Amino acid sequence: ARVKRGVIARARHKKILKQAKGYYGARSRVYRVAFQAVIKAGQYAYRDRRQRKRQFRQLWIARINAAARQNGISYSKFINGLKKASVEIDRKILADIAVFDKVAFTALVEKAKAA
Amino acid sequence: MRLNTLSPAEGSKKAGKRLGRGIGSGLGKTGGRGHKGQKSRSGGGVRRGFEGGQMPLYRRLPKFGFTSRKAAITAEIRLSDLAKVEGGVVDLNTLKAANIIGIQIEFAKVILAGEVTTPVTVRGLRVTKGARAAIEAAGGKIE
Amino acid sequence: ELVLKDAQSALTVSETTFGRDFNEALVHQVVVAYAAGARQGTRAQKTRAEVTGSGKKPWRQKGTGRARSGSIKSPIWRSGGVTFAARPQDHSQKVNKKMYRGALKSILSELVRQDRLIVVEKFSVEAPKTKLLAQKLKDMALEDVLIITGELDENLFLAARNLHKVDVRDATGIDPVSLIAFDKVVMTADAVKQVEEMLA
Amino acid sequence: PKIKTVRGAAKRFKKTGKGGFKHKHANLRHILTKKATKRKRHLRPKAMVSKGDLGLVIACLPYA
RNA sequence: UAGCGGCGAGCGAACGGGGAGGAGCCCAGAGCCUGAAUCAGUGUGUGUGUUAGUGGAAGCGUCUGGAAAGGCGCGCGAUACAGGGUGACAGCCCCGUACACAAAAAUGCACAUGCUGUGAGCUCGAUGAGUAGGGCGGGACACGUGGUAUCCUGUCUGAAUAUGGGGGGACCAUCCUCCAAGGCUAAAUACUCCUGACUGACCGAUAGUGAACCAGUACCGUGAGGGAAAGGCGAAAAGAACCCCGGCGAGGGGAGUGAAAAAGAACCUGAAACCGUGUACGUACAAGCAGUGGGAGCAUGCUUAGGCGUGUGACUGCGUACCUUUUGUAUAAUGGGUCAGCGACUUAUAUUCUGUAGCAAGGUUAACCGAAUAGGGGAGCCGAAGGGAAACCGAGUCUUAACU
Ligand SMILES: [Mg+2]
Ligand SMILES: [Mg+2]
Ligand SMILES: [Mg+2]
Ligand SMILES: [Mg+2]
Ligand SMILES: [Mg+2]
Ligand SMILES: [Mg+2]
Ligand SMILES: [Mg+2]
Ligand SMILES: [Mg+2]
Ligand SMILES: [Mg+2]
Ligand SMILES: [Mg+2]
Ligand SMILES: [Mg+2]
Ligand SMILES: [Mg+2]
Ligand SMILES: [Mg+2]
Ligand SMILES: [Mg+2]
Ligand SMILES: [Mg+2]
Ligand SMILES: [Mg+2]
Ligand SMILES: [Mg+2]
Ligand SMILES: [Mg+2]
Ligand SMILES: [Mg+2]
Ligand SMILES: [Mg+2]
Ligand SMILES: [Mg+2]
Ligand SMILES: [Mg+2]
Ligand SMILES: [Mg+2]
Ligand SMILES: [Mg+2]
Ligand SMILES: [Mg+2]
Ligand SMILES: [Mg+2]
Ligand SMILES: [Mg+2]
Ligand SMILES: [Mg+2]
Ligand SMILES: [Mg+2]
Ligand SMILES: [Mg+2]
Ligand SMILES: [Mg+2]
Ligand SMILES: [Mg+2]
Ligand SMILES: [Mg+2]
Ligand SMILES: [Mg+2]
Ligand SMILES: [Mg+2]
Ligand SMILES: [Mg+2]
Ligand SMILES: [Mg+2]
Ligand SMILES: [Mg+2]
Ligand SMILES: [Mg+2]
Ligand SMILES: [Mg+2]
Ligand SMILES: [Mg+2]
Ligand SMILES: [Mg+2]
Ligand SMILES: [Mg+2]
Ligand SMILES: [Mg+2]
Ligand SMILES: [Mg+2]
Ligand SMILES: [Mg+2]
Ligand SMILES: [Mg+2]
Ligand SMILES: [Mg+2]
Ligand SMILES: [Mg+2]
Ligand SMILES: [Mg+2]
Ligand SMILES: [Mg+2]
Ligand SMILES: [Mg+2]
Ligand SMILES: [Mg+2]
Ligand SMILES: [Mg+2]
Ligand SMILES: [Mg+2]
Ligand SMILES: [Mg+2]
Ligand SMILES: [Mg+2]
Ligand SMILES: [Mg+2]
Ligand SMILES: [Mg+2]
Ligand SMILES: [Mg+2]
Ligand SMILES: [Mg+2]
Ligand SMILES: [Mg+2]
Ligand SMILES: [Mg+2]
Ligand SMILES: [Mg+2]
Ligand SMILES: [Mg+2]
Ligand SMILES: [Mg+2]
Ligand SMILES: [Mg+2]
Ligand SMILES: [Mg+2]
Ligand SMILES: [Mg+2]
Ligand SMILES: [Mg+2]
Ligand SMILES: [Mg+2]
Ligand SMILES: [Mg+2]
Ligand SMILES: [Mg+2]
Ligand SMILES: [Mg+2]
Ligand SMILES: [Mg+2]
Ligand SMILES: [Mg+2]
Ligand SMILES: [Mg+2]
Ligand SMILES: [Mg+2]
Ligand SMILES: [Mg+2]
Ligand SMILES: [Mg+2]
Ligand SMILES: [Mg+2]
Ligand SMILES: [Mg+2]
Ligand SMILES: [Mg+2]
Ligand SMILES: [Mg+2]
Ligand SMILES: [Mg+2]
Ligand SMILES: [Mg+2]
Ligand SMILES: [Mg+2]
Ligand SMILES: [Mg+2]
Ligand SMILES: [Mg+2]
Ligand SMILES: [Mg+2]
Ligand SMILES: [Mg+2]
Ligand SMILES: [Mg+2]
Ligand SMILES: [Mg+2]
Ligand SMILES: [Mg+2]
Ligand SMILES: [Mg+2]
Ligand SMILES: [Mg+2]
Ligand SMILES: [Mg+2]
Ligand SMILES: [Mg+2]
Ligand SMILES: [Mg+2]
Ligand SMILES: [Mg+2]
Ligand SMILES: [Mg+2]
Ligand SMILES: [Mg+2]
Ligand SMILES: [Mg+2]
Ligand SMILES: [Mg+2]
Ligand SMILES: [Mg+2]
Ligand SMILES: [Mg+2]
Ligand SMILES: [Mg+2]
Ligand SMILES: [Mg+2]
Ligand SMILES: [Mg+2]
Ligand SMILES: [Mg+2]
Ligand SMILES: [Mg+2]
Ligand SMILES: [Mg+2]
Ligand SMILES: [Mg+2]
Ligand SMILES: [Mg+2]
Ligand SMILES: [Mg+2]
Ligand SMILES: [Mg+2]
Ligand SMILES: [Mg+2]
Ligand SMILES: [Mg+2]
Ligand SMILES: [Mg+2]
Ligand SMILES: [Mg+2]
Ligand SMILES: [Mg+2]
Ligand SMILES: [Mg+2]
Ligand SMILES: [Mg+2]
Ligand SMILES: [Mg+2]
Ligand SMILES: [Mg+2]
Ligand SMILES: [Mg+2]
Ligand SMILES: [Mg+2]
Ligand SMILES: [Mg+2]
Ligand SMILES: [Mg+2]
Ligand SMILES: [Mg+2]
Ligand SMILES: [Mg+2]
Ligand SMILES: [Mg+2]
Ligand SMILES: [Mg+2]
Ligand SMILES: [Mg+2]
Ligand SMILES: [Mg+2]
Ligand SMILES: [Mg+2]
Ligand SMILES: [Mg+2]
Ligand SMILES: [Mg+2]
Ligand SMILES: [Mg+2]
Ligand SMILES: [Mg+2]
Ligand SMILES: [Mg+2]
Ligand SMILES: [Mg+2]
Ligand SMILES: [Mg+2]
Ligand SMILES: [Mg+2]
Ligand SMILES: [Mg+2]
Ligand SMILES: [Mg+2]
Ligand SMILES: [Mg+2]
Ligand SMILES: [Mg+2]
Ligand SMILES: [Mg+2]
Ligand SMILES: [Mg+2]
Ligand SMILES: [Mg+2]
Ligand SMILES: [Mg+2]
Ligand SMILES: [Mg+2]
Ligand SMILES: [Mg+2]
Ligand SMILES: [Mg+2]
Ligand SMILES: [Mg+2]
Ligand SMILES: [Mg+2]
Ligand SMILES: [Mg+2]
Ligand SMILES: [Mg+2]
Ligand SMILES: [Mg+2]
Ligand SMILES: [Mg+2]
Ligand SMILES: [Mg+2]
Ligand SMILES: [Mg+2]
Ligand SMILES: [Mg+2]
Ligand SMILES: [Mg+2]
Ligand SMILES: [Mg+2]
Ligand SMILES: [Mg+2]
Ligand SMILES: [Mg+2]
Ligand SMILES: [Mg+2]
Ligand SMILES: [Mg+2]
Ligand SMILES: [Mg+2]
Ligand SMILES: [Mg+2]
Ligand SMILES: [Mg+2]
Ligand SMILES: [Mg+2]
Ligand SMILES: [Mg+2]
Ligand SMILES: [Mg+2]
Ligand SMILES: [Mg+2]
Ligand SMILES: [Mg+2]
Ligand SMILES: [Mg+2]
Ligand SMILES: [Mg+2]
Ligand SMILES: [Mg+2]
Ligand SMILES: [Mg+2]
Ligand SMILES: [Mg+2]
Ligand SMILES: [Mg+2]
Ligand SMILES: [Mg+2]
Ligand SMILES: [Mg+2]
Ligand SMILES: [Mg+2]
Ligand SMILES: [Mg+2]
Ligand SMILES: [Mg+2]
Ligand SMILES: [Mg+2]
Ligand SMILES: [Mg+2]
Ligand SMILES: [Mg+2]
Ligand SMILES: [Mg+2]
Ligand SMILES: [Mg+2]
Ligand SMILES: [Mg+2]
Ligand SMILES: [Mg+2]
Ligand SMILES: [Mg+2]
Ligand SMILES: [Mg+2]
Ligand SMILES: [Mg+2]
Ligand SMILES: [Mg+2]
Ligand SMILES: [Mg+2]
Ligand SMILES: [Mg+2]
Ligand SMILES: [Mg+2]
Ligand SMILES: [Mg+2]
Ligand SMILES: [Mg+2]
Ligand SMILES: [Mg+2]
Ligand SMILES: [Mg+2]
Ligand SMILES: [Mg+2]
Ligand SMILES: [Mg+2]
Ligand SMILES: [Mg+2]
Ligand SMILES: [Mg+2]
Ligand SMILES: [Mg+2]
Ligand SMILES: [Mg+2]
Ligand SMILES: [Mg+2]
Ligand SMILES: [Mg+2]
Ligand SMILES: [Mg+2]
Ligand SMILES: [Mg+2]
Ligand SMILES: [Mg+2]
Ligand SMILES: [Mg+2]
Ligand SMILES: [Mg+2]
Ligand SMILES: [Mg+2]
Ligand SMILES: [Mg+2]
Ligand SMILES: [Mg+2]
Ligand SMILES: [Mg+2]
DSSP, X not given: OOOOOHHHHHHHHHHHHHHTTTOSTHHHHOHHHHHHHHHHHHHHHHHHHHHHHHHHHHHHHHHHHHXXXXXXXXXXXXXXXXXXXXXXXXXXXXXXXXXXXXXXXXXXXXXXXXO | OOTTTOOOOTTSOOOOOOOSSTTTTSSOSSXXXXXXXXXTSTTOSOOTTOBTTBOOHHHHSOOOOOOOHHHXXXXXXXXXXXXXXXXXXXXXXXXXXXXXXXXXXXXXXXEOOSOOOSOOBOOSSEXXXXXXXXXXXXXXXXX | OBOXXXXXXXXXXXXXXXXXXXXXXXXXXXXXXXXHHHOOOOOOOXXXXXXXXXXXXXXXXXXXXXXXXOOSSOTTSTTSOOTTOOOOOOOOOOOOHHHHHHHHHHHHHHHHHHTOEEEESOOOOSSSOHHHHHHHHHHHTOSSEEEEBXXXXXXXXXXXXXXXXXXXXXXXXXXXXXXXXXXXXXXXHHHHXXXXXXXX | OOXXXXXXXXXXXEEOXXXXXXXXXXXXXSOOSSSOHHXXXXXXXXXXXXXXXXXXXXXXXXXX
């Protein structure tokens, strides 16, 4: 029983070249080059789910550190102030509040000033 | 049951190792035979009893003995397979027809392997001391 | 033990032939083996030796900026080779007498539970004509059948040769695959008696 | 084709009841006068093959 | 297995048993009596076969379609539902098939049998000399000169010749067994250039023969020799009359044929690499495996009175390809121009182990006989007992004078 493999291979190559859609030059056209791009893309994607959680924390922390210093307190002292008052609110929201509702935010900086 | 509905017992069939079919296969690229050297090579591996050029065990040890021609043509008749012949007579030609000992066996011996019931007169045949007690305890007289 | 459909006579058949537990593995092995026995296995590709062409190196070992070749016939080249060329082979596999008998005893007893086995008295067509056989199966309410008979009538044989779904084996020539394949099995009282003695 | 026994091995080993192999000891052919009697006595009876070099023996004689 | 063997690698019997098939004669010659039973004429003359052949059953109506064998509904032949064709898949349209039948003729055969021609029976025996054997040297025997029988001989020699001689694995002696030195013999057995039929868990145009095709051709080589590539319009050529542009060209546009002409002969399908034309977005102060997380804008698709898809991706954090081989590779170490196709742990028999199924102190058959995957055939094999170099003894036995 001979097995021609033209139907199955095509379906394998065409699947990867579909993931490589958008890439420059051979990386979108040429299986042998695309297949590398698609693995590398996977590797970077896998690592960047880890880095996304880091980047955003830095982003929020910067926002909070900015919005705190407008009210006369540094980030380091503010967070200790909040921890010592048993405030459980995270960076993600403090950063959201910092941008949107500053009149509210100010109350957290006062709440921190108590400690 | 239909021709389709039949299936084997679980554990009966086990696929088979297929070497050189990608990473996911486990074995794949060097089909479980490592990197380089004589054993990796097609038609590779040394012959039997080869110890890297050290004198082999089957040559450093001395030869002994000689093959007896008499031992080839003598049987050890089991006493359990004794009353399976012709009532209670077991010469040699009678025992040979029962397919207990080979055709080219002149000398033969009844040993104590356990279990006799019927009386058997064992003629023209060498008999063991334990079997002599058994055969006579069952009933039959030797020679 | 087995009632008929035009008599109601108590044919006392043996218990450990027609009343056993269905051992699926055994049956599967015997039927697979039976199938494997049907193969003729007549095929051949030709190895790099058997291909036509010279042993000459097309180009020399070194010097030309090309991949070292030793033969036109090498299986990595086009139009020559097939690495592990098939040789005509025998796929028939051994089945132990007791396993074959055990499988028949297993399958033939499951026909009694499923009611595919229609035991009958004298079963024979009048003259060698399919029209009659086909017409008499309408009353019996059958279509895809294995008509097992002890005394193999030529009249009955000839009259089922053209009928596709009907097959007329002799009681001696029952098979594992056949008994399973056909949707009903019609055995003659003599044939049951012969099969009883054959399987034992 | 059937496997061939390594005959030389078949002439130096013998299969015991359990599965192990008995063999004669080395150092008892020549140069005996310098050897102590105690050695020559201990080398006289047959000896079982070691578990390390059992696999080498089992392969080279596959019938008995 | 026994043996052989730098006793290494390896080589490897026989006796005996089960089967297939069976079959024997003639010469080295003298009585009575006679051509007779045997081979072979040649015949003819039957039976067959082979090389031409003949008949050979029974379907219609609607629906879809270019076309019906299709679907739907009712019939009918079947010793014919093998298979093939026919405008899509046909038991019943056609060719076949089962089956029944054929030969003027030339042949393969199968026995009556007239017979140019050839000795049945019968007894007296004869009963194969440069031979057997030997020395020397080689070879064949499973057996490598070994303690080597047996066989063959190049060379040199040499019996006895049935009161005799050969073999029984150095050799001898007793027993047993055969009768060399001359011939001829069917079957079982091996093979397939070739002729048919039939079959494939064989291939389906880079496969299968090298060769589906005007292939051992083209082409290459002084020559021996090497040796390609290259299949498919459509149901039917109905192969595009006639116009128009062009050089009364190529090539096109119409028109027509067809169900369809991006089925128009560079002709089923028509992928990918590769090269284009048009639409959306981005892109001419910006440094690197070109992506990836983040993300504005713009363009489209939608439900809308929120936004969510899709394409693009300004700006920005991180980020030196894959394979190989290595202590270690972004490595400036190897391999890859790209795509498509093909391209590497197989098969047979033995063997040990694991799983699984059968049956169990038993298990189990081989060739073969069966037309037959049934079922016979247990010849065997393996197991149920081992110890010892071996005789031998044996739930023991070896060691040893004997063993705590
Ligand atoms: Mg296959
Ligand atoms: Mg195929
Ligand atoms: Mg593709
Ligand atoms: Mg792939
Ligand atoms: Mg594509
Ligand atoms: Mg994209
Ligand atoms: Mg994009
Ligand atoms: Mg592409
Ligand atoms: Mg593309
Ligand atoms: Mg594309
Ligand atoms: Mg976090
Ligand atoms: Mg399964
Ligand atoms: Mg499983
Ligand atoms: Mg497993
Ligand atoms: Mg396999
Ligand atoms: Mg693995
Ligand atoms: Mg691994
Ligand atoms: Mg391994
Ligand atoms: Mg390697
Ligand atoms: Mg190495
Ligand atoms: Mg290695
Ligand atoms: Mg090789
Ligand atoms: Mg090698
Ligand atoms: Mg050395
Ligand atoms: Mg020795
Ligand atoms: Mg020795
Ligand atoms: Mg036997
Ligand atoms: Mg070869
Ligand atoms: Mg050559
Ligand atoms: Mg050459
Ligand atoms: Mg180069
Ligand atoms: Mg190249
Ligand atoms: Mg070719
Ligand atoms: Mg080929
Ligand atoms: Mg191939
Ligand atoms: Mg291959
Ligand atoms: Mg097999
Ligand atoms: Mg197999
Ligand atoms: Mg059988
Ligand atoms: Mg069916
Ligand atoms: Mg000594
Ligand atoms: Mg010392
Ligand atoms: Mg000492
Ligand atoms: Mg010592
Ligand atoms: Mg064995
Ligand atoms: Mg054996
Ligand atoms: Mg010898
Ligand atoms: Mg030597
Ligand atoms: Mg040596
Ligand atoms: Mg040889
Ligand atoms: Mg040989
Ligand atoms: Mg050989
Ligand atoms: Mg033999
Ligand atoms: Mg023999
Ligand atoms: Mg005999
Ligand atoms: Mg016979
Ligand atoms: Mg004759
Ligand atoms: Mg004569
Ligand atoms: Mg004469
Ligand atoms: Mg004639
Ligand atoms: Mg004639
Ligand atoms: Mg005829
Ligand atoms: Mg004809
Ligand atoms: Mg006709
Ligand atoms: Mg007809
Ligand atoms: Mg219509
Ligand atoms: Mg219409
Ligand atoms: Mg249709
Ligand atoms: Mg439908
Ligand atoms: Mg119909
Ligand atoms: Mg209907
Ligand atoms: Mg109807
Ligand atoms: Mg009908
Ligand atoms: Mg059919
Ligand atoms: Mg047919
Ligand atoms: Mg037919
Ligand atoms: Mg057709
Ligand atoms: Mg069509
Ligand atoms: Mg067709
Ligand atoms: Mg119809
Ligand atoms: Mg029909
Ligand atoms: Mg019609
Ligand atoms: Mg025919
Ligand atoms: Mg007939
Ligand atoms: Mg005729
Ligand atoms: Mg005529
Ligand atoms: Mg004539
Ligand atoms: Mg004639
Ligand atoms: Mg002829
Ligand atoms: Mg003579
Ligand atoms: Mg003579
Ligand atoms: Mg003469
Ligand atoms: Mg002599
Ligand atoms: Mg001579
Ligand atoms: Mg001589
Ligand atoms: Mg001599
Ligand atoms: Mg001389
Ligand atoms: Mg000499
Ligand atoms: Mg010599
Ligand atoms: Mg030698
Ligand atoms: Mg030789
Ligand atoms: Mg020699
Ligand atoms: Mg000598
Ligand atoms: Mg020797
Ligand atoms: Mg020697
Ligand atoms: Mg002699
Ligand atoms: Mg002889
Ligand atoms: Mg004389
Ligand atoms: Mg004389
Ligand atoms: Mg003699
Ligand atoms: Mg002689
Ligand atoms: Mg003699
Ligand atoms: Mg002798
Ligand atoms: Mg001999
Ligand atoms: Mg005597
Ligand atoms: Mg005699
Ligand atoms: Mg005589
Ligand atoms: Mg001679
Ligand atoms: Mg002769
Ligand atoms: Mg002849
Ligand atoms: Mg004859
Ligand atoms: Mg033939
Ligand atoms: Mg042929
Ligand atoms: Mg095929
Ligand atoms: Mg080709
Ligand atoms: Mg094609
Ligand atoms: Mg092509
Ligand atoms: Mg070629
Ligand atoms: Mg030329
Ligand atoms: Mg051509
Ligand atoms: Mg074409
Ligand atoms: Mg035209
Ligand atoms: Mg013009
Ligand atoms: Mg012109
Ligand atoms: Mg013009
Ligand atoms: Mg012109
Ligand atoms: Mg013109
Ligand atoms: Mg023109
Ligand atoms: Mg024109
Ligand atoms: Mg034209
Ligand atoms: Mg045109
Ligand atoms: Mg046109
Ligand atoms: Mg047109
Ligand atoms: Mg038209
Ligand atoms: Mg039209
Ligand atoms: Mg139309
Ligand atoms: Mg079309
Ligand atoms: Mg179309
Ligand atoms: Mg159209
Ligand atoms: Mg049209
Ligand atoms: Mg058109
Ligand atoms: Mg057009
Ligand atoms: Mg058009
Ligand atoms: Mg089209
Ligand atoms: Mg066109
Ligand atoms: Mg179209
Ligand atoms: Mg078309
Ligand atoms: Mg063309
Ligand atoms: Mg084209
Ligand atoms: Mg085209
Ligand atoms: Mg076509
Ligand atoms: Mg077509
Ligand atoms: Mg086309
Ligand atoms: Mg396209
Ligand atoms: Mg394309
Ligand atoms: Mg491109
Ligand atoms: Mg391009
Ligand atoms: Mg722009
Ligand atoms: Mg733009
Ligand atoms: Mg700009
Ligand atoms: Mg600047
Ligand atoms: Mg710019
Ligand atoms: Mg740059
Ligand atoms: Mg950089
Ligand atoms: Mg990107
Ligand atoms: Mg992205
Ligand atoms: Mg993203
Ligand atoms: Mg946006
Ligand atoms: Mg917009
Ligand atoms: Mg992006
Ligand atoms: Mg800008
Ligand atoms: Mg960035
Ligand atoms: Mg970087
Ligand atoms: Mg790196
Ligand atoms: Mg590499
Ligand atoms: Mg290297
Ligand atoms: Mg290095
Ligand atoms: Mg690195
Ligand atoms: Mg590199
Ligand atoms: Mg570079
Ligand atoms: Mg290097
Ligand atoms: Mg380099
Ligand atoms: Mg390398
Ligand atoms: Mg290197
Ligand atoms: Mg390169
Ligand atoms: Mg392969
Ligand atoms: Mg392997
Ligand atoms: Mg296989
Ligand atoms: Mg065999
Ligand atoms: Mg085996
Ligand atoms: Mg095991
Ligand atoms: Mg196991
Ligand atoms: Mg199990
Ligand atoms: Mg089991
Ligand atoms: Mg059981
Ligand atoms: Mg049991
Ligand atoms: Mg049991
Ligand atoms: Mg027991
Ligand atoms: Mg048994
Ligand atoms: Mg059995
Ligand atoms: Mg026969
Ligand atoms: Mg036969
Ligand atoms: Mg018979
Ligand atoms: Mg028969
Ligand atoms: Mg039969
Ligand atoms: Mg028997
Ligand atoms: Mg049996
Ligand atoms: Mg023993
Ligand atoms: Mg022992
Ligand atoms: Mg003793
Ligand atoms: Mg002793
Ligand atoms: Mg003792
Ligand atoms: Mg004592
Ligand atoms: Mg004692």
